Amino acid sequence: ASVQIVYKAEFXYK
Amino acid sequence: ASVQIVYKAEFXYK
Separation between Cα atoms, residue A1 and residue B7, nearest integer Å: 13
Among chain B residues, the shortest Cα distance to A4 is held by B8
Alpha carbon dihedral B4, A2, A14, B11, in 10-degree steps, equals 0
Q: Cα A13 from chain centroid?
A: 8
On chain B, the residues whose CB falls within 8 A of the CB of A4 are: 6-8
Q: Is A7 in contact with B4 (CB distance < 8 Å)?
A: yes
User: To one decimal place, what's the resolution in Å?
Assistant: 1.8
Q: In what order do the strands lie in the sheet with B3-7?
A: A11-13, A3-7, B3-7, B11-13
